[PDB]
């Protein structure tokens, strides 16, 4: 019956205070109960609060909740941030029936400068084609923190048939790594006039174009 | 003292059958309802379905249902997940956990889950051993690479002209399609002057095959 969306990532410093939104599709967000779930790379899930602003039994103070009737949305605020905070977060919520997960919200406990990614865009090599395929590779690098959002776009139109994209990796100099892949055929390839790689990091989107026509 | 303790990882094939367990231990396994949940590699959770062992009452998100099967044998603590025919798009982390997050001015309702199964990775895969192919990618400063295309199993190594060449060399991690295969890419970052009087050579070697290509990549 409904959706939950949060952001896909979210950062801020040691000692400082952050907040998590989840908004609610269909029906009000108040007419059933948000749960907070912590989960760390490996570990298992773990509640935070539940009962909207409720605090399981030994999740320190630092964690709170919040419901926003106007936007339709619940909130995880975490104060006095600290480094074992960094983890994926997820709202969650029931239908009366079903329940409901948000799709996560990466959060990163900064521990250098926010980096934009540089992007790299390689249209099919011309000895490629001749085995009848096609690939677009962009490749994504020095990223902080690690956590991006990558679209691909013919002409004006997304695209997300024939698109594989890793996680982010650490690389040898602490930022982070990340690629992406466009399947065509030639013809595909030869018939729009150009191809988009977008990389959202932090809210700004990093852009590059190739072309059929060099 | 609660426990939900699942079996192990799960190394299976296309078409095979699997049946996974979750065993809970330190309290009633018939007074509470087992949920199982799905999260895919670098994906969210997604519910999958709910079980109360004390009568096998089961239901299943609408995502789910008639492509999976829950059941429980209470008699042994043990809620089972089972897929008759697994898909390569099946493999992920699969959780079990318990119903027992209650709301206190309620005391007959149960809301959320509040204990969870360790997990039980599942992968699966129909790709057989496969050498990669590779592509040139060509170029104050250029960039040029090697596509490395459609290989099974991991690793594979990339170098740049014997290993003579390090300086500006980014192999990037391989991505995991949705075919089974492995791709990556390597580049190299190198002045733009060099690109008329050096040649660039990628080095690839992949043992499991025996493939060896070495690609000239040409302005």
């Known amino acids: 019956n409904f959706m939950l969306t949060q952001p896909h990532s979210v950062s801020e410093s040691p000692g400082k205070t952050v907040t998590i939104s989840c908004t609610r599709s269909?029906?009000?967000?108040?007419?059933?109960?948000v749960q907070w779930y912590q989960q760390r790379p490996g570990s298992s899930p773990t509640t935070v609060i539940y009962?909207?602003?409720?605090?399981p039994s030994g999740v320190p103070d630092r964690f709170s909740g919040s419901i926003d009737s106007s936007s339709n949305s619940a909130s995880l605020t975490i104060s006095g941030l600290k480094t074992e905070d960094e983890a994926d977060y997820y709202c969650?919520?029931?239908?009366?029936?079903?329940?409901?997960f948000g799709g996560g919200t990466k959060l990163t406990v900064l521990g250098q400068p926010k980096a934009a990614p540089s992007v790299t865009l390689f249209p099919p090599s011309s000895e490629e084609l001749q085995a009848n395929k096609a690939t677009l590779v962009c490749l994504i690098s020095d990223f902080y923190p690690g956590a991006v959002t990558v679209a691909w776009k013919a002409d004006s139109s997304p695209v997300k048939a024939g698109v594989e994209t890793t996680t982010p990796s650490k690389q040898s100099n602490n930022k982070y790594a990340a690629s992406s892949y466009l399947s065509l055929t030639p013809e595909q390839w030869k018939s729009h006039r150009s191809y988009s790689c977008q990389v959202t990091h932090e809210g700004s989107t990093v852009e590059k174009t190739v072309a059929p026509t060099e | 003292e609660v426990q939900l303790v699942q079996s192990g990882a799960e190394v299976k094939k296309p078409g095979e059958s699997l049946k996974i367990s979750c065993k809970g231990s330190?309290?009633?396994?018939?007074?509470?309802?087992i949920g199982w949940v799905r999260q895919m590699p670098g994906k969210g959770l997604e519910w999958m379905g709910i079980?109360?062992?004390?009568?096998?009452?089961?239901r299943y998100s609408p995502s789910f249902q008639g492509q999976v099967t829950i059941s429980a044998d209470k008699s042994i603590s043990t809620a089972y997940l089972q897929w008759s025919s697994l898909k390569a798009s099946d493999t992920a982390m699969y959780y079990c956990?318990?119903?027992?997050?209650?709301?206190?001015?309620?005391?007959?309702?149960?809301?959320?889950?509040?204990?969870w199964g360790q997990g039980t990775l599942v992968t699966v895969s129909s790709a057989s051993t496969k050498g990669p192919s590779v592509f040139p990618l060509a170029p104050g400063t250029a960039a040029l690479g090697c596509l490395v295309k459609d290989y099974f199993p991991e690793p594979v190594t990339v170098s740049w002209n014997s290993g003579a060449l390090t300086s500006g060399v980014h192999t990037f991690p391989a991505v995991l399609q949705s075919s089974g295969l492995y791709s990556l890419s390597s580049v190299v970052t190198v002045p733009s002057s060099s690109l008329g009087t050096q040649t660039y050579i990628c080095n690839v070697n992949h043992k499991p095959s025996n493939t060896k290509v070495d690609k000239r990549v040409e302005p």
């Open positions: 956990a318990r119903l027992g997050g209650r709301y206190y001015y309620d005391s007959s309702g149960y809301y959320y889950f509040d204990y």
């Open positions: 330190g309290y009633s396994f018939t007074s509470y309802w």
């Open positions: 079980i109360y062992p004390g009568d096998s009452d089961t």
């Open positions: 269909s029906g009000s967000i108040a007419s059933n109960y």
């Open positions: 009962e909207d602003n409720q605090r």
């Open positions: 969650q919520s029931y239908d009366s029936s079903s329940w409901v």
